[PDB]
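Hey team,

Sharing the Phosphatidylinositol 4-phosphate 3-kinase C2 domain-containing subunit alpha run so nobody has to redo it. Sequence (827 residues) first:
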Amino acid sequence: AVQNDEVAAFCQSIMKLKTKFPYTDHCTNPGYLLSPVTVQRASVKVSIEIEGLQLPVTFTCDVSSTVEIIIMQALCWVHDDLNQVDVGSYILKVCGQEEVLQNNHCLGSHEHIQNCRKWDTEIKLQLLTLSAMCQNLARTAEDDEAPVDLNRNIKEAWTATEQLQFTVYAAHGISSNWVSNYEKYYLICSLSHNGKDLFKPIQSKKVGTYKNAAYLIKWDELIIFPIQISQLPLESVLHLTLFGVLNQSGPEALGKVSLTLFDFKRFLTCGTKLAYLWTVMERIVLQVDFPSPAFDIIYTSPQIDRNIIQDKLETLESDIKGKLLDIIHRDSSFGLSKEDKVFLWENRYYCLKHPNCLPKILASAPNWKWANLAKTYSLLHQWPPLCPLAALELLDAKFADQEVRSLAVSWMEAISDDELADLLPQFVQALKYEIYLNSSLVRFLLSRALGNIQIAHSLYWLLKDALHDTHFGSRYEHVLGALLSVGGKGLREELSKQMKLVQLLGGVAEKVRQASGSTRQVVLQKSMERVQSFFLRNKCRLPLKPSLVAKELNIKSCSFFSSNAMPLKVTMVNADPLGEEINVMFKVGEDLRQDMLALQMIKIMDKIWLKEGLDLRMVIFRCLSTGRDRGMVELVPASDTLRKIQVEYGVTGSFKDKPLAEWLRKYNPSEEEYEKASENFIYSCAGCCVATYVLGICDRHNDNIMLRSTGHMFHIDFGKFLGHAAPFVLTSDMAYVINGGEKPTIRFQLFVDLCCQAYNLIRKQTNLFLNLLSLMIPSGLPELTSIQDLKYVRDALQPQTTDAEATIFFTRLIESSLGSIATKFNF
Ligand SMILES: CS(=O)(=O)Nc1cccc(-c2csc(NC(=O)CSc3nc4nccnc4c(=O)n3CCc3ccccc3)n2)c1
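Structure output:
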């Protein structure tokens, strides 16, 4: 009955958000995907199709020049004098791909450009105007005008002395497999804020089902906490963990319930409140009765302190300033001893010069008591703006305060769509630490989605994948409903076709696995015919890369890889005849979400390196979980497992060093071509080695390691992630490729330099990797479950030590990985 009120006011806020994104604004409503930029620290051939020219124009562009000047370098090839064409109208799309280049960005800073250079493929763009560039996704006047629908006494609280108490009445609708399995049941009640218990939990008494009511458990027990309303922060949560002692022939948790002690309008919970814990998907109703005074108790925030605290200061230098600087320059807040905490908290007004340390300060607060909020808030308002990545820590569970979080979101406005897009999973998890449906965060994400179609696309797939969390399933239903609503008729119809495609592909995969031995191909062709029927009545965009528009299935290219998963090779025809055909893997019966995380962490190491001008030539491939234990995976062309290389070589010749080199000589015959390709191997192997050690991917064998024909090395099956007890292994044929001989060369010295440089550049961002892995804890991936799992990664990243002693540390890992051939080299 406030739940309906809360939703109603959300919708009101979301209508008001929409008014800032009118259909007419091409900036915020372009109707097309933007080709992604990743800002980079020389020259290239671009081929541009031009309307009314039989041949496309090919010329050299300074990779450093802006798409804007390139657009008319290309009008200068057809037009001798360009006053009689409006350059503004013209845009540049990638051939085959309904994605448009960003005028005010470098050519070199586009993902599509960096990728072509890496693979040495033809950059193929199309010159065209806004009028002729597909806009089927654009929002309409109807969409903007349309409504938002989804899928008296006053005591203040600081004066309220009433002790927090409530009666756990009953649970209703317990299944009959429960009434057999367990005799008695019991609730563990837990009171928390900032993700931590305020008091030790209180157990209810142990009670069986009520007389003549096998669907009902009745406790009718008053529970009293040793705390009064005054002492409860606004974001205080109640957690009733229902448990069940097994009948003869340790009681198991049967479900959890969340209950905010205040509601969205700051009023304390009064009266009877119902919550729903889910077990299949069957709905049990828990009745908690809170007191009903004649009066409403409302949380009021303290009186604001306007004092501005600078100018004259103690400026003591007894090494106390040095110790403060030491903890300011500490990698992170992780491991920070209670002593380091009080020290910071006192010299906090001296730290005002180093904005990105605020998280250490807030985590070193003595408490979040009403009294002390006034001085913590004063600081926050005079505090300088934080880097968006630094602010991310302030949306973790640790900081539940609504002013901290809302201010973290204001600093984050600074971030580019292009960087947020690779950070969306973390942001979708953080939504579990907003106790209220409306919040600065969900408005920030919904407003970014309105303004940028890649972000709306990715939010879609990530919210759908969060619906499956039984505890937060309802929160995410309302966030999804608001996104789908505010996205328009255009966006939703493509997302429906996209949903429809993945479901059919999943059906096909299930049936192919069910089919046994021969006739598996015949089953694939028969099941694929329904997808053939689906494309006959629909053009559809590819979920993995919605820039690609499939129109048709190519059945004779459609295949199944030979594996326990039996993944399918889905080949599709591009709807643009300027395009190349579409190849993806659809895999069923593996939870891809962890594969997705490995990839993201690798991609962020890439970006960190590119930032500092280090290019390790990394293969960056996409993976999307479409539901639970299924999704679509990018296929890398002209690549093969290490195993398969060694096997092929084993048939002719018995030299262990020769196989990788012989495979690369076959696809790169010229000495220059072989050199270019072994150098791609040096660089990409180095990135792979660093990534393997930091992320703890210790599972690397001849099957997990892949090799593109161009020389680039990469990993595919991230089965073991953050693994505990040489973390990477360099075989003798890997060594041969880097040396380019069986004796060592300065190419091996280039390999170690690259490993160490790249390693230090990741250690300088230790705090980003920790925040990005903590924010994924609530996601329920098996080997990322506690704040201990992070410590292994921090341990691997060795942050106390200089770049000098880290370089010695990693160089010793390389000596160790070489195993027995290590003796051939000099360290
Ligand atoms: C310009 S174009 O459009 O015409 N070329 C193009 C474009 C896109 C894709 C393909 C394509 C078709 S088949 C393929 N893959 C291979 O050649 C190597 S196999 C393999 N590659 C993996 N890449 C990544 C992530 N994962 C994988 C994985 O799992 N595999 C399968 C590994 C395997 C080996 C042996 C038995 C079972 C599974 N790319 C072409």
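The pocket of IG3 is lined by residues 561-563, 569, 580-581, 583, 621, 633-637, 639-641, 716 (CB under 6 Å).

Ping me if you want the raw files.
A.
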